[PDB]
Design an enzyme around this catalytic site. Structure first.
Site, PDB file in Angstrom:
ATOM      1  N   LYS B   5       0.823  -1.110   0.239  1.00 31.19           N
ATOM      2  CA  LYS B   5      -0.011  -0.099   0.002  1.00 31.19           C
ATOM      3  C   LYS B   5       0.834   1.249   0.193  1.00 31.19           C
ATOM      4  O   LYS B   5       0.610   2.088  -0.802  1.00 31.19           O
ATOM      5  CB  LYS B   5      -0.843   0.020   1.279  1.00 31.19           C
ATOM      6  N   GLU B  31      -4.054   8.854  12.235  1.00 32.94           N
ATOM      7  CA  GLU B  31      -2.684   8.266  12.053  1.00 32.94           C
ATOM      8  C   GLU B  31      -2.068   7.630  12.799  1.00 32.94           C
ATOM      9  O   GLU B  31      -1.700   8.726  14.135  1.00 32.94           O
ATOM     10  CB  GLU B  31      -1.778   9.179  10.823  1.00 32.94           C
ATOM     11  N   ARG B  32      -1.503   6.556  13.192  1.00 29.04           N
ATOM     12  CA  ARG B  32      -0.518   6.114  14.209  1.00 29.04           C
ATOM     13  C   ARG B  32       0.699   6.703  14.034  1.00 29.04           C
ATOM     14  O   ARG B  32       1.208   7.091  13.150  1.00 29.04           O
ATOM     15  CB  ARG B  32      -0.305   4.610  13.973  1.00 29.04           C
TER      16      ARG B  32
HETATM   17  N1  LIG Z   1       6.694  -3.426  -6.486  1.00 22.71           N
HETATM   18  C1  LIG Z   1       7.361  -3.918  -5.537  1.00 22.71           C
HETATM   19  N2  LIG Z   1       8.433  -4.428  -5.444  1.00 22.71           N
HETATM   20  C2  LIG Z   1       9.123  -5.019  -4.359  1.00 22.71           C
HETATM   21  N3  LIG Z   1       8.501  -5.213  -3.241  1.00 22.71           N
HETATM   22  C3  LIG Z   1       7.369  -4.810  -3.105  1.00 22.71           C
HETATM   23  C4  LIG Z   1       6.679  -4.034  -4.115  1.00 22.71           C
HETATM   24  N4  LIG Z   1       5.432  -3.629  -3.397  1.00 22.71           N
HETATM   25  C5  LIG Z   1       5.398  -4.309  -2.235  1.00 22.71           C
HETATM   26  N5  LIG Z   1       6.547  -4.716  -1.950  1.00 22.71           N
HETATM   27  C6  LIG Z   1       7.035  -5.382  -0.747  1.00 22.71           C
HETATM   28  O1  LIG Z   1       5.911  -5.507   0.395  1.00 22.71           O
HETATM   29  C7  LIG Z   1       6.116  -4.973   1.550  1.00 22.71           C
HETATM   30  C8  LIG Z   1       4.886  -4.211   1.788  1.00 22.71           C
HETATM   31  O2  LIG Z   1       5.146  -3.035   2.654  1.00 22.71           O
HETATM   32  P1  LIG Z   1       4.523  -1.607   2.556  1.00 22.71           P
HETATM   33  O3  LIG Z   1       3.399  -1.764   1.432  1.00 22.71           O
HETATM   34  O4  LIG Z   1       5.706  -0.861   2.467  1.00 22.71           O
HETATM   35  O5  LIG Z   1       3.818  -1.210   3.941  1.00 22.71           O
HETATM   36  P2  LIG Z   1       2.282  -1.782   4.147  1.00 22.71           P
HETATM   37  O6  LIG Z   1       2.375  -3.228   4.232  1.00 22.71           O
HETATM   38  O7  LIG Z   1       1.739  -0.799   5.321  1.00 22.71           O
HETATM   39  O8  LIG Z   1       1.547  -1.233   2.673  1.00 22.71           O
HETATM   40  C9  LIG Z   1       7.377  -3.986   1.561  1.00 22.71           C
HETATM   41  O9  LIG Z   1       8.138  -4.182   2.462  1.00 22.71           O
HETATM   42  C10 LIG Z   1       7.942  -4.282  -0.098  1.00 22.71           C
HETATM   43  O10 LIG Z   1       9.141  -4.962   0.197  1.00 22.71           O
END
Ligand SMILES: Nc1ncnc2c1ncn2[C@@H]1O[C@H](COP(=O)(O)OP(=O)(O)O)[C@@H](O)[C@H]1O
Lengths: 159, 318, 47, 132, 272, 125, 157
Positions: B5, B31-32
């Protein structure tokens, strides 16, 4: 409900009588998988008592899980490690019932007291499999295990 | 969480600031503090925020979770105010991220309760509809510019008819469903191609070629979803030639939907790509028509335009 | 909402009654066999 | 020409194949079936069927029991209850079983057991004569 | 109903849906295995039938004895497999008893025995259990043939009813005839088979009986497993389609309960 | 991280074929092995009142369980193995546990030594 | 609801029309197991009328009890007496449906008055089993059972 829910925190031991068990005729209706305690520990009641109590609870819970399958398949389809589980669980359910001295008006039977050692020994034996040869109804409303053996013999004779 | 996200938010911010010149606002309602600090530092790392050279593309507004309800019900309006400036007094497009939009309705509900108003259907304020309307109705495309709002949505009790989501969904013009089941498969962004929907998937709005390509991809992916069960039951060897061809096409399309993000370079290492609309339509037209039945699946994983997929296919056999 | 274990009996619907009846059938049969075997053993053990 | 069909319950070796000649055992007497053999019904005995393709190739499958039918339209059906290629057997086991059976046939517990042991004897005997 | 009743029903239906789904998986596995095993058995049984196919043996229609063998398993939950087989068995038995034949019935599988233990209860000659628990084998067919021949019933004709496995969706209740050495001997069509005394001919008849029993066992087992796969798939889909409505009702009732309790609280507050 | 990263996935796979556990047979070796690994992994996570374990000992136990040195063991005995293996490692190989605790990582040298320890103990059980 | 719940105590005969039946196309949608009367007495309506009505209600109630299993395990998992009961219950559910005069504009069918004796006779016959050979739809939207037999004849060609 708020009232019992709030009371639960003020007790050192709860024995949740259940209507579903009382419908099966098991009296007292105490629900084995909802009655708890604070001294049910291997240090306060001993290793063997604790192991047997947890074994009873686990076998009853396994039986609860199995009943869902038995609903559809029928019970002849169950494997042979589970038909044993169901039979043992039914035997334990029956053996948990007991006739009280104040219920002689209802049941007609004679009230009994089962000291702790008889209960632990009888449940050890029922779990181990030392009574797979007696019908389950042999355990219904009896005191110590020897009385269940005698009742099974009497049923056989009168058969 | 765990689906991409924040990375998707950062990529949208970057692309819209790069392919349109329009800035972005992030109104973290409820927001946390931990998550707010993590988002701030992720942005600083990813370059959308920059602490040195006055070229940041995001304006962050934070109504923290430990502020009285009267302050969590108004932060969305602060974000809208900043974005409305960027739209009216600078005549451009804007992105407006609202994480979360449920906490907005909840804050309004608590404020209304505090004031002493009879709670409505399920405890929500009587003014839920117009509280949502006054905010959601300033996110529009006037004759100077537009505000496009991406509103993270939480559905209480997995209940899509709850008054909060029921009132919110009357305003949503599209839906994007990030799903874990596609982060496991390694496809990123996790956007679920089938749950995701849109109002402007209408030949009049997007056009006939775009519309037909989109429906072709949806149809083939639905067919592959249906065939996955049969492959999992009766075995793969009992599928017709056409069924196997559709399975190949569907797997290739799946892999082609994945893209590398300029802000997730440190994860993939792949240089980020920004695929223009027409290139995407061309690539999917070609993949569907069968022009690329003679390439391997992995030639499509994490590539930009289709021509880049062809280049990868060559370089993986040399 | 989730699913528990042994909820078919709790519901008390047609499936709960059907399950209980099936179980009673099977164990009535096995109890008859065990009673017969117990009588036979008690006769084979006087010798 | 001949349409052969050799098929154990578990597996099928030939399905409407086209072989030149097939040599099969039988209760009456082991004999050969060619592309026009007169129709017959027989029930096999523990032995080894030998097949020859249209060419001069050969193949030997040891069959326990079954039935071989030769039809008016030149179609041989050799259904064998247990058909195993020779490369699946071991000598010592069969030889020891045969010697044990011969030893126990002295013990005329009953005519039915005598017959059972006799069947086992000549079964293992055909096994060894095929492998010796 | 009250919120508790809907909650409890929904939990039970979820349990049932999960059970049927896992059942459909298991039935699919056993089906793949059985349909893989049926390939050699199909050609084996067809070869076994070939003789009576291509040298027609019209039985002498002035016999008194018959035998009807039905094939199925002990287990249910498989659509109308046992229903169709028992229907065919009773149809044939009644049609034959119209002429006063001394019919008899062998039931392979307890379900067939049970479905026909009300009418045709007496005509049973012998029946077998533990069918379909494990895949059948030629040993099972040999056992059935032995227990048939030894049983002192000199049947002059017979039929075997089973469920030929057309395809994963469809099966056909087929019936194959079977004869006795007294019919084969007197069948003029056997004049063109040499080395045919009354020893090889009837040993061959015993083997042919075992062959047809095994072929029918394999066909019926495959059909039963395919039917159970389809039946449990349909049951799982019905359970899910019911859970949809039950979940909608549960959410409506949950919101109604919240609103009602809240209105009671605020109406008490206002009243004082 | 090194160990629980794969333990999480093993349990995730087990949790989606858990229902079959009753049927158990009638299923391929794939799901059979899935839910034979899952049961062992589950029985490793059982623990008793007021007896927390040091991180290195948790890592050692989960290592034994997930690397595969337990799939040849009847599930009911797993706990015993644990309660034995743990103590054994605590007594003899304190140096290895110290190295895991301080380095905070399973270096391939420590990895090999731990594999040797697990194999040797599991041999004599 | 408090309003109907309160008014239930002021009526001699209730007639609970239900949306579940109407969605099946049966009309009038009357629910047979919620409709009641105070003159359903064997000393008021006689014994044949009372017995037929109670047999209809018994069989409909049995079918309702079966519906829970039928909706999942299909009708292929019922005893033979249960299959026969379900067949009779469906025939009766349909036969209760009638075409009204005022609903000609809706249905086009001709409106029927079924005298009481004809109703008792028809339901007595359906319960006895004199019509286990006809199909369910032969009873849908017909007057006396003569029309049911006639429609079953029409369907057979
Ligand atoms: N396009 C992408 N390429 C590589 N890794 C991804 C991609 N999209 C998401 N991820 C991985 O999924 C994880 C989800 O974390 P993130 O989206 O940053 O926070 P949240 O889980 O709160 O949305 C990230 O740590 C990331 O490494």
């Amino acid at each position: 409900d708020p009232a019992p829910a709030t009371t639960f925190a003020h007790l050192d031991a709860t024995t949740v009588l259940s209507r579903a068990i009382a419908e099966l005729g098991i009296y007292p209706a105490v629900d084995p998988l909802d009655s708890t305690s604070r001294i049910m520990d291997p240090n306060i009641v001993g290793s063997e008592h604790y192991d047997v109590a947890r074994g009873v609870q686990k076998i009853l819970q396994d039986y609860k899980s199995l009943q869902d399958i038995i609903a559809i398949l029928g019970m002849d389809e169950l494997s042979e490690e589970d038909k044993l589980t169901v039979s043992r669980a039914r035997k334990i359910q029956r053996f948990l019932s007991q006739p009280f001295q104040v219920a002689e008006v209802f049941t007609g039977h004679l009230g009994k007291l089962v000291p702790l050692k008889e209960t632990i020994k009888g449940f050890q034996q029922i779990l181990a499999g030392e009574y797979d040869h007696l019908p389950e109804q042999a355990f219904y409303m009896v005191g110590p295990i020897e009385e269940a053996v005698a009742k099974a013999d009497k049923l056989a004779e009168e058969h | 969480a765990g689906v991409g996200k924040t990375v998707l938010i950062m990529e949208l911010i970057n692309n819209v600031a790069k392919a349109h010149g329009g800035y972005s606002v992030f109104a973290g309602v409820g927001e946390r503090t931990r998550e707010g600090n993590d988002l701030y530092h992720e942005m600083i790392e990813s370059g959308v925020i920059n602490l040195k050279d006055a070229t940041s593309k995001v304006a962050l507004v934070y109504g923290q979770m430990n502020e009285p309800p009267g302050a969590r019900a108004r932060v969305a309006l602060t974000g809208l105010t900043v974005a409305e400036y960027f739209r009216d007094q600078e005549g451009q497009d804007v992105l407006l991220f609202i994480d979360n939009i449920f906490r907005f309705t909840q804050a309004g509900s608590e404020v209304s309760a505090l004031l002493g108003r009879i709670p409505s259907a399920v405890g929500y304020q009587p003014t839920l509809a117009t509280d949502m309307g006054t905010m959601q109705e300033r996110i529009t495309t006037t004759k100077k510019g537009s505000i496009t709002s991406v509103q993270a949505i939480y559905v209480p009790a997995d209940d899509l008819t709850d008054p909060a989501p029921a009132t919110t969904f009357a305003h949503l013009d599209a839906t994007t469903v990030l799903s874990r089941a596609i982060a496991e498969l390694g496809i990123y962004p996790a956007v679920d191609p089938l749950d995701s929907t849109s109002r402007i998937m209408d030949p009049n709005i997007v056009g006939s070629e775009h519309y037909d390509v989109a429906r072709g991809v949806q149809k083939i992916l639905q067919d592959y979803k249906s065939l996955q069960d049969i492959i999992a039951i009766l075995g793969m060897d009992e599928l017709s030639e056409e069924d196997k061809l559709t399975v190949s096409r569907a797997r290739k399309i799946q892999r082609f939907l994945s893209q590398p993000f300029q802000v997730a370079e440190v994860f993939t290492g792949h240089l980020g790509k920004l695929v223009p609309l027409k290139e995407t339509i061309k690539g999917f037209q070609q993949i569907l028509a069968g022009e690329y039945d003679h390439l391997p699946e992995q030639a499509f994983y994490m590539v930009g335009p289709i021509e880049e997929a062809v280049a990868k296919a060559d370089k993986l056999a040399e | 909402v989730r699913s528990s274990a042994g909820a078919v009996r709790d519901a008390g619907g047609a499936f709960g009654k059907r399950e209980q009846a099936e179980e009673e059938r099977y164990f009535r049969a096995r109890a008859k066999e065990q009673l017969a075997a117990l009588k036979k053993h008690h006769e084979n053990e006087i010798s | 020409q001949m349409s052969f069909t050799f098929a154990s319950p578990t597996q099928v070796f030939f399905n409407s194949a086209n072989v030149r000649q097939v040599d099969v055992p039988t209760q009456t007497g082991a004999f050969g079936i060619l592309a026009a053999h007169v129709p017959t019904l027989q029930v096999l005995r523990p032995g080894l069927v030998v097949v020859h393709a249209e060419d001069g190739t050969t193949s030997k499958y040891f069959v326990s029991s079954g039935s071989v039918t030769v039809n008016a339209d030149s179609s041989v059906q050799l259904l064998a209850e247990e058909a195993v290629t020779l490369d699946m057997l071991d000598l010592g086991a069969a030889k020891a079983n045969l010697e044990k059976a011969q030893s126990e046939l002295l013990g005329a517990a009953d005519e039915a057991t005598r017959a059972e042991i006799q069947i086992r004897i000549e079964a293992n005997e055909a096994l060894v004569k095929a492998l010796e | 109903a009250t919120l508790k009743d809907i909650t409890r029903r929904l939990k039970s239906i979820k349990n049932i849906q999960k059970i049927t789904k896992s059942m459909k998986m298991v039935a699919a596995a056993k089906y793949a295995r059985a349909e893989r095993e049926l390939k050699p058995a199909r050609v084996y049984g067809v070869g076994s039938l070939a003789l009576y196919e291509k040298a027609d043996i019209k039985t002498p229609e002035d016999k008194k004895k018959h035998l009807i063998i039905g094939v199925s398993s002990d287990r249910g939950l498989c659509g109308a497999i046992h229903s169709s087989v028992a229907k065919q068995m009773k149809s044939e038995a009644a049609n034959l008893a119209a002429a006063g034949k001394e019919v008899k019935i062998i039931g392979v599988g307890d379900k067939i025995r049970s479905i026909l233990h009300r009418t045709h209860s007496d005509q049973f000659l012998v029946t077998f259990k533990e069918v379909g628990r494990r895949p059948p084998t030629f040993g099972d067919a040999s056992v059935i043939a032995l227990e048939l021949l030894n049983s002192g019933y000199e049947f002059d004709e017979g039929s075997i009813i089973f469920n030929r496995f057309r395809s994963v969706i469809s099966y056909k209740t087929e019936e194959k005839p079977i004869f006795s050495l007294d019919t084969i001997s007197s069948a003029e069509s056997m004049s063109i088979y040499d080395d045919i005394d009354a020893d090889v001919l009837r040993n061959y008849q015993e083997y042919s009986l075992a062959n047809i029993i095994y072929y029918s066992l394999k066909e019926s087992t495959t059909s039963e497993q395919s039917a159970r796969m389809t039946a449990m798939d349909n049951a799982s889909k019905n359970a899910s389609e019911m859970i949809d409505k039950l979940t909608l009702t549960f959410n409506r009732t949950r919101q109604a309960v919240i609103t009602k309790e809240l209105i009671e609280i605020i109406s008490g507050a206002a009243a004082l | 991280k090194q160990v629980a990263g794969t333990m999480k996935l093993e349990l995730a796979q087990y949790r989606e074929v858990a229902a079959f556990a009753q049927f158990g047979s009638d299923l391929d070796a794939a799901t059979q092995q899935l839910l034979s690994r899952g049961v062992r992994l589950t029985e490793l996570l059982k623990q008793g009142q007021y007896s927390p374990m040091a991180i290195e000992e948790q890592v050692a136990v989960i290592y034994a369980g997930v690397r595969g040195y337990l799939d040849k063991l009847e599930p009911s005995k797993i706990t015993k193995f644990e309660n034995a293996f743990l103590s054994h490692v605590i007594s003899q190989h304190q140096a290895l546990l110290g190295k895991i605790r301080t380095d905070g990582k399973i270096s391939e040298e420590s990895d090999a030594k731990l594999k040797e320890i697990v194999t040797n103990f599991l041999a004599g059980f």
